[PDB]
């Protein structure tokens, strides 16, 4: 029968364990989303440790709904955890209302409940970012949640490491109005911006949300469009 | 089973028999029915034997509970109030209990009637039981607000003497007690044999 | 020192130095002495004064027809374990309708005490109950600990200075099994004025015997009985 | 032994957070109240407006029963807890039993409750002191205060806030027998008392009366402008 | 339990100088229907008593697992102690009185007989939990057959052998070959005496049928 | 489907004399037409000043009669005093209203002296309602007994007839004559009678057998 | 059972009940009130479960206090009837439900007086006269005769009289005295006890 | 050996949550509402203005919350989030109760004893957040309120935020209007506010926010008022500039 | 370190009972006597205002009809022990149609008196001394809050009952009479108090066999304190 939370205020209000996990996000893996003008493309940076590893293990493009995904900057583990809440969540709109729950449902829902998170004891906040992309209703959209509840909503964006450099990246190259694969094109400019050199099928992974649908892209396609996307 | 109360001018009159029956078989001819509350309150059995004991001894209690807490005496409305706060509980369940409650108030006398129905009022003139309606008839035949003393304890006892005589369920005793100002008297306990002698002739 | 604060946390030698602080409080108590013969039990206390007029506090309390006790320590854990002792002897009393076996009621008491020995929040109990019980085989005699580890003997005596009576049980044990119930007795109190310091005598007043029998109930006295167990003595060797 | 937990008892036995809740109580706004024998009377001061407000929200006076008056001490949502809870037990008590609810009931209740509320643990007690006026048993008047401890205290007039003991005092060099049963004496006792505020500024004194069977009547400050023309015109007749 | 579905028949039991005999038979019929024509009705407590009954045998088997622990239990205490049939009669009885208490009761006819200390002992336990003590118990039918017989044979004589007693048992056991319908010609007799707790086999009976040829 | 409660017959007497208190009951136990035993005294010594007689349901006598024994405990053992007679009225009106709705089919009374040594019958119903009488017939054979008692001890509807106060001895040929003239008609009664006599001394027992069928 | 009247007028609320608390044989009680003040424009009536007129009266009546005390004004007659046909709604899905019949006369500074009529079944209801009884058909049936929107408060009061003058005619109980308030933009004022001569 | 104070006093008698709260409350961007009798308005100002986003939300502060009231707000935005969830959750079981709208007082109130409850016991990290309250009713018409986490609140017509709005406050008093429910000079005169108090050169539309609520018939409708028309009323105060420099 | 309520003293117990029976002795003092004639006692208001109504202050209540009572130390704890003691004497009277005998009432108060729990609240700071008249004539009665009850032949507490305690030992004896322990009484109160004896000061609780009704005396304490 613990828990006062945690969290006091700072003597000047600030907040220092979340801001303890926001390094822990900077301290995360790379990764960028870009909202194109059909849908948004999601591309992580997933360099195994070892030549030995499998990749076809761990997978961090992860739908919620077949129009519906996401990927996140933080850690795995935690990430399954609250990937399964966001799944059970969205198996209670469909319940509900019978209908696939809006992305802008499930950020005021999922972030609420991460917001219970800062604000619930017992442990630690989620040091988890996360990107949540779906093309709802025409509009494909893409939301930017924290650690510590919040969002925002971005044409482009990265998190993890050098994001303020493949931002200013994003910033200079990017614009409002390009495609799909053009989205892959830039994207994959400000991967290798700040990823290592050795970049293959494996070190990367893509997913995108079309109108028609999300469709999480394999290391096939990975390596057809990024056998020297330009 | 038959009991009246009514207050006038001095205070008000209690009175019952004292026959409690098994069915068609006599348990006992002398039976208080009329629970002695306080010094200052009296209550009878008017239905259910531990519905009236019980409930008016947790009634007594709860009265000197409050007396105990606000060093003062309760009233015959907050009595029967609290009584049918309590009696409520248990509505429909099966538990007959339709009681006087009689005492003084500081606004005077003090006259309330409850049943387990919820039916707690005030009034005048009441009287409970198999042979109620006799004693209805007598005592609403001779009722007056300005009767005296042994004028009322006459009135009540022919009262009884009459509901007993023409009721198999009431007899026994007849009890009779006169809530004053200050408290109720004891004022007699005669049997029916004595008033069949006294008022046959 | 900062480990010395709690129940669950070890010492660097092992040693939980509170339970050690409880047998302090234990050894705070007034000096009892229980003893048995092979037929009869007789359990003896100190009583103590608040002051003049204040009454002298017991130590000896009835709570079975064949079982007495004795106490030293903390008196309101030893009224819950009073009632939960006479708790358990209706239970079985009750539902078994039988008089209690004193070990299995006993290491019932150790059980009940070892939660409290045992977790976070819970402190131990001072206790000082020296246990005279009768079941089929007769006399037993137990005494316990804050430690709860309840011991069986033929005679013991905890208190203040209880360690003179205790060489007392060690030269007369021999004789405590086959004599009688008067002049063992006087041997009990042949123990407590050696619980005494010896610049005052053993009085009326402060003092109290229960006696329980294989054919004798439970019966505690105060200066009435105790004035024909006071004669029948010699003086101090001065 | 330490000036933390409400729990613990110093080395000579007290309790400090009772004593630093009566702290607060002690540095809050200032408030007097009298009983006449008919017309019971009270008033706080330091209405202090600030231009830019509505003032009928900050009202520190109000009524659980029709029969009876509230103000406190201290802060004022603590407060504001006590009175809407004693308006559900007020009218509890009027639901049970169809008596008018008298003082020493609710004070207990409210005293009561402060108390056992300071018992149980990790619960930050009520830093305020309540003033009770209720004229009911046959309109008698009647005032009470509590405490931070949570002790029901009868007085015969009251003051409280900052210099409590100043205005209290001169409550003593005030006490006449006479104030009372000439209710006009008792508007000029309340306006002493006003008159003798540690400010009296004139216009941050808010009063409220109650003839024991009318309502909770709210004065003007133009009829006590008048009492400070006639409390003024009074040392002037003493000069 | 409202509704039992394998129930036995009437047990005897009776004491005699020096212990107690109880006798049963071995059949478990469900309904009009035989379909268990060799049971075992009778728990054999370790030394001292042992527990015939009727009724529900699963209920007998759930008592038998339940007591059995218990005296698992106190055996495993060491203490030198154990239950004396009285108390075996007393917790059965708050058993079955908390039992019927809950409304839920346990179709069950049971009878403690424990000699120990030198004393017999015959106690009765209802279903209802209506219990006493008797120096001779005939449930079932045997209440209205072989119970006239009992006490006709205790009025005619207090005190009794175990061969008296014994060959009584044999022919009033008999008699409920006779007319029981719920019968069979297989039964155990056990004993509870100082010498210990004894378990016969599958004795049988010896009937007559010489008036059939009679009109 | 299970019925909770049986008749397990019964029959008590018990007589509030002068300074005695005489509870004789039959120990004859029947249920419909089989005797279980002939032996079931319905009389229990509680203390010296208190014998209790139980009939009705056979399970709830004995475990009310261990319940009140346990709170005999409890009242002496909590204050090392015995209690009253009619505080063991009050507290056993209290359980008995404390299974309202599932009652007792029981009928009790409780004999014993008061603090004047004096005798104290308390009758009861199944519901817990009591007061102190004189004599009291519970059981089958009420009817059976109380005009008697009436006309003996009451001396009711009798003309110039005195009241001398029934002594001891006549009261125990009362008692054997009352007993075997219900035995002649009740079929719940017989065998056996266990007779107690609550004095300021102690307590007498006493049983005189009856007839055997 | 026994009668209720809830009259609306154009500015005024004639309401009338009974003083009777007879009981299956006698009458009881002859001067009986079951008009309830909820507050200086809203009244209650009610005919039910005894026990449950009085304890919801109870509930009712306090909690519309507790509003006027706490918030210190008075509630709507129209929400304030919602909250309680709210009441009756959590009571009627319950171990305990009610059967009281209830009928509520409010006022309003701007829609003037108001007229709610509820079951025991919790039904909201927006009238212009409503009853109870046997009563309920032979005087609806008369005012239905009589209904006049735009109608005096006198004629409302002549015509109750003429109403309970043929309720005196064909009816079986005895019903003889009769209570009566009226609403008007002050608020609650009683009109005298409605009694009759039979013959 | 862990815990923090989260229930109690500093030392000599004062507070400590609320006073670092009230700390994170003046560090966050302005809003006002001013002084209207047909409506009411409420400017605020716009935080994390980067380029980027996408800014289809069209409510950042206010919370328009049942039919005819909004808020605008400050402090911690998920955790004002649960409380306007949480508010419109009671409000709207008001709703439920009676039918009728809420008399947004014992609402203020309600949610000042939710925060409430959280400063006296529980001893968690309380909301350090103060709101805005806007709204109408049949008994005071168009209402303003200010959210503490002390529990306490405030009816106001000229209300007040943290470092940013000091200067704006003694702006309302030294040029506090009165008796005039003129929106457009409301209007000047917060752009006069948002003019000097906001550093914004030029006073941008997209670094601020405006939006209105006003009495139509029955339905007291919530102008949430488009970005042209804050252009020219940039442009119309930037010309009230140009009056002020006629007397250069 | 002040190891609270589950911390023994290295020696001994609870370093917060000892701040309890510590709180006791700031308190005022009383002093109850029993005589065999019936059990006076009295205690020590200490009024300190003008406006200080002295009839407000309460000390002995009164528990049962033959029951008086004396606090000493924590006020509306001691008096939440009244009512539910006396709930519980009517609870004996309640199931026993009699009253509760006064060493068992405080036995009753006494199980309590160390049932503070603040998991599975504080411990109290409360002396009491009890009067009562049982079916063993008058009794006089002192606990504490570490419930260690003893029956006392006359007691004083609060401040200065050492010295109260002592002249106390010096003036009892077996065979004291009523009026004789009543002045004498006072005599040891303006002994121990620094303010003059008038009415205000103090207030007596005589219980008798013949008077169990009536633990007061009213306005003739006046001329008892124009006795001396």
Same mark, same amino acid.
């Not at chain 1, 802008?104 to 999922?110: G, P, S």
């Not at chain 2, 009246?4 to 002398?30: E, M, N, P």
């Not at chain 2, 005592?139 to 009767?147: T, W």
């Given at each position: 029968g613990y828990s006062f939370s945690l969290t006091t205020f700072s003597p000047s209000g600030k907040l220092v364990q979340i801001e303890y996990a926001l390094a822990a996000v900077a301290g995360g893996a790379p990764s960028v989303g870009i909202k194109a003008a059909n849908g948004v493309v999601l591309a992580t940076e997933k360099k195994q440790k070892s030549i030995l590893y499998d990749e076809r293990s761990v997978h961090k493009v992860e739908p919620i709904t077949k129009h519906i995904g996401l990927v996140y900057s933080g850690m795995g583990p935690d990430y399954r955890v609250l990937v399964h809440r966001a799944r059970k969540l969205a198996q209670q709109y469909?319940?509900?209302?019978?209908?696939?729950?809006?992305?802008?449902?499930?950020?005021?829902?999922?972030?609420?409940?991460?917001?219970?998170?800062?604000?619930?004891?017992?442990?630690?906040?989620?040091?988890?970012?996360?990107?949540?992309?779906?093309?709802?209703?025409?509009?494909?959209?893409?939301?930017?949640?924290?650690?510590?509840?919040?969002?925002?909503?971005?044409?482009?964006?990265?998190?993890?490491?050098?994001?303020?450099?493949?931002?200013?990246?994003?910033?200079?190259?990017?614009?409002?109005?390009?495609?799909?694969?053009?989205?892959?094109?830039?994207?994959?400019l400000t991967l290798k911006e700040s990823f290592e050199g050795q970049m293959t099928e494996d070190n990367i992974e893509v997913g995108i949300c079309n109108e028609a649908g999300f469709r999480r892209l394999t290391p096939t396609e990975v390596k057809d469009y990024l056998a020297a996307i330009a | 089973?038959?009991?009246?109360?009514?207050?006038?001018?001095?205070?008000?009159?209690?009175?019952?028999?004292?026959?409690?029956?098994?069915?068609?078989?006599?348990?006992?001819?002398?039976?208080?029915?009329?629970?002695?509350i306080n010094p200052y309150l009296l209550g009878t059995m008017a239905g259910g034997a531990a519905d009236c004991s019980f409930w008016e001894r947790l009634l007594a209690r709860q009265c000197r509970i409050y007396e105990l807490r606000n060093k003062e005496r309760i009233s015959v409305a907050a009595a029967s109030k609290?009584?049918?706060?309590?009696?409520?509980?248990?509505?429909?369940?099966?538990?007959?209990?339709?009681?006087?409650?009689?005492?003084?108030?500081?606004?005077?006398?003090?006259?309330?009637?409850?049943?387990?129905?919820?039916?707690?009022?005030?009034?005048?003139?009441?009287?409970?039981?198999?042979?109620?309606?006799?004693?209805?008839?007598?005592?609403?035949?001779?009722?007056?607000?300005?009767?005296?003393?042994?004028?009322?304890y006459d009135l009540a006892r022919r009262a009884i003497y009459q509901a007993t005589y023409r009721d198999a369920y009431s007899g026994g005793a007849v009890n009779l007690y006169h809530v004053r100002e200050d408290g109720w008297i004891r004022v007699s306990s005669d049997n029916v044999a004595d008033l069949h002698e006294k008022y046959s002739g | 020192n900062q480990y010395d604060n709690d129940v669950t946390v070890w010492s660097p030698q092992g040693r939980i130095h509170q339970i050690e602080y409880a047998m302090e409080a234990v050894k705070q108590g007034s000096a009892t002495v229980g003893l048995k013969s092979k037929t009869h039990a007789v359990l003896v206390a100190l009583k103590r004064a608040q002051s003049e007029l204040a009454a002298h506090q017991k130590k000896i309390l009835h709570v079975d027809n064949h079982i007495g006790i004795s106490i030293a320590g903390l008196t309101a854990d030893a009224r819950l374990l009073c009632n939960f002792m006479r708790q358990e002897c209706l239970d079985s009393r009750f539902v078994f309708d039988r008089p209690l076996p004193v070990s299995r009621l006993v290491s019932l008491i150790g059980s009940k005490t070892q939660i409290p020995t045992q977790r976070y929040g819970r402190r131990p109990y001072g206790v000082g109950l020296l246990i005279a019980g009768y079941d089929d085989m007769g006399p037993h005699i137990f005494q316990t600990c804050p430690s709860a580890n309840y011991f069986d003997c033929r005679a013991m005596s905890i208190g203040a200075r209880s360690q003179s009576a205790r060489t007392y049980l060690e030269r007369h044990m021999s004789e405590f099994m086959e004599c009688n119930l008067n002049e063992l007795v006087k041997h009990g109190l042949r123990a407590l004025r050696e619980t005494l310091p010896a610049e005052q005598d053993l009085t009326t007043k402060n003092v109290s015997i229960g006696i329980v029998g294989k054919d004798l109930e439970f019966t505690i006295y105060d200066d009435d009985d105790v004035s024909p167990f006071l004669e029948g003595l010699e003086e101090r060797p001065q | 032994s330490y000036d933390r937990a409400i729990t613990v008892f110093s080395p000579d036995g007290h309790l400090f957070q009772v004593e630093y809740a009566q702290e607060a109580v002690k540095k809050g706004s200032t408030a007097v109240g009298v009983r006449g024998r008919d017309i019971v009377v009270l008033g706080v001061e330091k209405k202090s407006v600030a231009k830019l407000q509505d003032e009928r929200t900050v009202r520190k006076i109000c009524a659980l029963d029709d029969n009876v008056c509230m103000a406190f001490a201290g802060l004022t949502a603590d407060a504001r807890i006590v009175i809407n809870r004693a308006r559900v037990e007020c009218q509890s008590h009027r639901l049970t039993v169809e008596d008018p609810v008298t003082v020493?009931?609710?004070?207990?209740?409210?005293?009561?409750?402060?108390?056992?509320?300071?018992?149980?643990?990790? *619960? *930050?007690?009520?830093?305020?002191?309540?003033?009770?006026?209720?004229?009911?048993?046959?309109?008698?008047? *009647?005032?009470?205060?509590?405490?931070?401890?949570?002790?029901?205290?009868?007085?015969?007039?009251?003051?409280?806030?900052?210099?409590?003991?100043?205005?209290?005092?001169?409550?003593?060099?005030?006490?006449?027998?006479?104030?009372?049963?000439?209710?006009?004496?008792?508007?000029?006792?309340?306006?002493?008392?006003?008159?003798?505020?540690?400010?009296?500024?004139?216009?941050?004194?808010?009063?409220?009366?109650?003839?024991?069977?009318?309502?909770?009547?709210?004065?003007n400050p133009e009829e006590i402008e008048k009492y400070v023309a006639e409390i003024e015109k009074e040392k002037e007749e003493n000069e | 339990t409202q509704n039992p579905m394998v129930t036995g028949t009437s047990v005897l039991g009776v004491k005699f100088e020096g212990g107690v005999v109880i006798a049963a038979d071995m059949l478990g019929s469900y309904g009009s229907l035989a379909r268990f024509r060799n049971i075992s009705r009778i728990m054999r407590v370790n030394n001292s008593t042992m527990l015939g009954a009727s009724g529900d045998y699963a209920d007998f088997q759930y008592l038998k697992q339940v007591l059995g622990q218990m005296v698992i239990d106190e055996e495993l205490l060491g203490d030198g102690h154990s239950y004396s049939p009285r108390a075996i009669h007393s917790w059965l009885t708050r058993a079955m009185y908390s039992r019927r208490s809950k409304m839920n009761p346990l179709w069950n006819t049971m009878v403690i007989g424990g000699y120990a200390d030198g004393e017999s002992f015959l106690g009765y336990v209802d279903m209802l939990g209506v219990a006493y003590e008797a120096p001779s118990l005939a449930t079932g039918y045997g209440a209205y057959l072989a119970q006239p017989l009992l006490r006709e044979v205790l009025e005619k004589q207090p005190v009794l052998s175990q061969t008296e007693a014994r060959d009584l048992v044999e022919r009033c056991m008999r008699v409920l070959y006779y007319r029981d319908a719920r019968s069979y010609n297989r039964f155990q007799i056990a004993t509870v005496t100082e010498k210990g707790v004894e378990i016969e086999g599958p004795l049988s009976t010896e009937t007559n049928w010489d008036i059939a040829h009679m009109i | 489907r299970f019925s909770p409660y049986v008749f397990n017959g019964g029959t008590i007497l018990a007589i509030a004399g002068e300074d005695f208190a005489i509870v004789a009951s039959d120990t004859r136990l029947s249920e419909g037409f089989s005797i279980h035993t002939r032996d079931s005294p319905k009389c229990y010594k509680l203390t010296d000043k208190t014998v209790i007689g139980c009939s009705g349901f056979h399970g709830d006598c004995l475990t009310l009669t261990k319940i009140i024994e346990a709170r005999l405990k409890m009242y002496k053992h909590s204050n090392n005093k015995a209690m009253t007679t009619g505080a063991i009225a009050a507290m056993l009106s209290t359980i008995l209203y404390s299974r309202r709705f599932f009652p007792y089919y029981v009928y009790n009374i409780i004999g014993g002296l008061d603090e004047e040594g004096k005798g104290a019958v308390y009758s009861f119903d199944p519901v817990g309602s009591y007061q102190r009488d004189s004599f009291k017939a519970g059981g089958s054979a009420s009817a059976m007994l109380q005009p008697l008692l009436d006309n003996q001890v009451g001396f009711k509807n009798m003309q110039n007839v005195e009241h001398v106060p029934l002594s001891l001895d006549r009261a125990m040929r009362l008692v054997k004559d009352v007993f075997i003239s219900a035995a002649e008609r009740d079929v719940y009664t017989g065998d056996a009678l266990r007779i107690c006599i609550v004095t300021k001394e102690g307590i007498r027992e006493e049983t005189v057998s009856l007839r055997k069928d | 059972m026994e009668y209720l009247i809830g009259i609306q007028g154009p500015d005024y609320v004639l309401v009338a009940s009974d003083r009777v608390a007879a009981s299956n044989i006698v009458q009881m009680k002859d001067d009986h009130d079951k008009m309830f003040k909820m507050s200086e424009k809203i009244l209650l009536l009610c005919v039910g479960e005894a026990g449950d007129t009085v304890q919801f009266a109870e509930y009712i009546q306090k909690n519309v206090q507790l509003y006027k005390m706490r918030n210190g004004y008075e509630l709507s007659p129209t929400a304030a009837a919602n909250f309680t046909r709210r009441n009756l709604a959590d009571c009627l899905r319950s171990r305990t439900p009610y059967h009281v019949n209830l009928l509520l006369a409010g006022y309003d500074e701007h829609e003037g007086p108001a007229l709610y009529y509820m079951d025991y079944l919790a039904a909201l209801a927006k009238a212009p006269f409503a009853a109870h009884g046997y009563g309920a058909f032979l005087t609806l049936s008369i005012l239905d005769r009589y209904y006049t929107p735009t109608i005096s408060r006198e004629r409302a009061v002549e015509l109750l009289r003429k109403c309970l003058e043929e309720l005196q005619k064909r009816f079986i109980l005895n019903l003889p005295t009769f209570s009566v308030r009226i609403i008007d933009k002050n608020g609650i004022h009683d009109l005298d006890n409605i009694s009759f001569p039979k013959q | 050996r862990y815990d923090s104070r989260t229930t109690i006093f500093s030392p000599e008698g004062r507070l400590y949550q609320v006073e670092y709260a009230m700390e994170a409350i003046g560090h966050a961007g302005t809003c006002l509402g001013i002084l209207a009798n047909d409506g009411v308005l409420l400017a605020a100002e716009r935080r994390n203005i980067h380029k980027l986003l996408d800014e289809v939300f069209f409510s950042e502060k206010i919370y328009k919350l049942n039919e005819d009231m909004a808020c605008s707000v400050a402090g911690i935005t998920s955790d004002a989030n649960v409380l306007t969830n949480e508010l419109r959750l009671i409000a709207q079981r008001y709703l439920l109760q009676y039918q009728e709208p809420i008399p947004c007082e014992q609402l203020v109130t309600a949610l000042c004893d939710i925060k409430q409850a959280y400063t006296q016991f529980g001893g968690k990290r309380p909301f350090g957040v103060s709101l805005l309250y806007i709204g109408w009713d049949k008994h005071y018409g168009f209402q303003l309120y200010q959210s503490d986490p002390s529990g306490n609140y405030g009816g106001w017509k000229a209300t007040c935020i943290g470092n940013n709005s000091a200067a704006a406050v003694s702006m309302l008093k030294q040029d506090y209007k009165e008796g005039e429910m003129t929106l457009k000079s409301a209007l000047a005169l917060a752009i006069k506010v948002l003019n000097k108090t906001m550093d914004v050169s030029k006073l941008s539309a997209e670094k601020v926010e405006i939006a209105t609520l006003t009495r139509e018939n029955g339905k007291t409708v919530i102008r949430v008022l488009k970005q042209k028309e804050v252009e020219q009323l940039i442009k119309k105060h930037e010309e009230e500039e140009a009056k002020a420099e006629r007397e250069k | 370190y002040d190891r609270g309520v589950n911390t023994f003293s290295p020696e001994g117990r609870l370093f917060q009972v000892e701040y309890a029976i510590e709180a006791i002795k700031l308190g005022s003092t009383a002093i109850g006597i029993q005589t065999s004639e019936g059990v006076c006692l009295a205690v020590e208001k200490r009024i300190t205002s003008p406006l200080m109504e002295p009839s407000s202050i309460e000390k002995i209540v009164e528990i049962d009809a033959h029951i008086g009572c004396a606090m000493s130390g924590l006020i509306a704890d001691a008096?939440?022990?009244?009512?539910?003691?006396?709930?519980?004497?009517?609870?004996?009277?309640?199931?026993?149609?009699?009253?509760?005998?006064?060493?068992?009432?405080?036995?009753?108060?006494?199980?309590?008196?160390?049932?503070?729990?603040?998991?599975?609240?504080?411990?109290?700071?409360?002396?009491?001394?009890?009067?009562?008249?049982?079916?063993?004539?008058?009794?006089?009665?002192?606990?504490?809050?570490?419930?260690?009850?003893?029956?006392?032949?006359?007691?004083?507490?609060?401040?200065?009952?050492?010295g109260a305690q002592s002249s106390l030992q010096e003036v009892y004896h077996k065979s004291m009479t009523l009026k004789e322990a009543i002045k004498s009484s006072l005599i040891i109160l303006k002994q121990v108090m620094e303010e003059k004896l008038n009415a205000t000061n103090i207030e007596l609780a005589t219980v008798q066999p013949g008077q169990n009704f009536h633990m007061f005396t009213k306005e003739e304490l006046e001329e008892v304190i124009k006795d001396i």
């Open positions: 469909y319940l509900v209302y019978q209908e696939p729950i809006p992305t802008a449902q499930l950020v005021q829902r999922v972030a609420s409940v991460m917001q219970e998170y800062t604000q619930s004891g017992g442990v630690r906040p989620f040091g988890v970012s996360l990107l949540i992309c779906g093309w709802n209703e025409g509009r494909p959209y893409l939301f930017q949640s924290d650690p510590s509840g919040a969002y925002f909503a971005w044409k482009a964006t990265a998190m993890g490491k050098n994001y303020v450099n493949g931002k200013t990246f994003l910033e200079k190259r990017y614009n409002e109005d390009l495609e799909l694969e053009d989205a892959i094109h830039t994207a994959i | 089973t038959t009991t009246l109360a009514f207050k006038f001018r001095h205070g008000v009159i209690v009175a019952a028999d004292s026959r409690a029956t098994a069915g068609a078989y006599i348990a006992s001819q002398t039976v208080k029915k009329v629970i002695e609290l009584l049918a706060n309590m009696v409520y509980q248990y509505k429909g369940m099966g538990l007959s209990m339709g009681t006087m409650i009689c005492g003084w108030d500081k606004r005077g006398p003090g006259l309330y009637y409850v049943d387990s129905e919820g039916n707690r009022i005030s009034g005048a003139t009441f009287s409970v039981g198999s042979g109620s309606v006799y004693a209805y008839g007598v005592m609403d035949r001779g009722y007056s607000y300005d009767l005296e003393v042994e004028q009322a | - | 020493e009931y609710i004070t207990r209740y409210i005293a009561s409750l402060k108390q056992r509320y300071t018992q149980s643990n990790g *619960r *930050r007690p009520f830093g305020i002191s309540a003033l009770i006026v209720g004229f009911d048993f046959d309109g008698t008047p *009647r005032l009470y205060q509590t405490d931070p401890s949570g002790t029901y205290h009868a007085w015969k007039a009251n003051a409280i806030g900052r210099g409590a003991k100043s205005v209290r005092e001169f409550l003593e060099k005030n006490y006449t027998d006479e104030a009372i049963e000439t209710d006009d004496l008792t508007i000029k006792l309340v306006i002493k008392a006003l008159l003798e505020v540690v400010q009296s500024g004139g216009k941050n004194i808010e009063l409220a009366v109650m003839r024991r069977d009318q309502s909770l009547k709210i004065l | - | - | - | - | 008096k939440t022990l009244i009512d539910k003691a006396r709930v519980e004497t009517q609870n004996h009277w309640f199931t026993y149609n009699e009253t509760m005998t006064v060493e068992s009432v405080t036995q009753a108060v006494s199980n309590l008196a160390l049932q503070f729990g603040e998991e599975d609240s504080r411990p109290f700071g409360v002396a009491l001394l009890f009067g009562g008249v049982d079916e063993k004539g008058p009794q006089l009665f002192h606990m504490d809050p570490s419930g260690t009850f003893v029956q006392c032949d006359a007691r004083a507490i609060g401040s200065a009952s050492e």
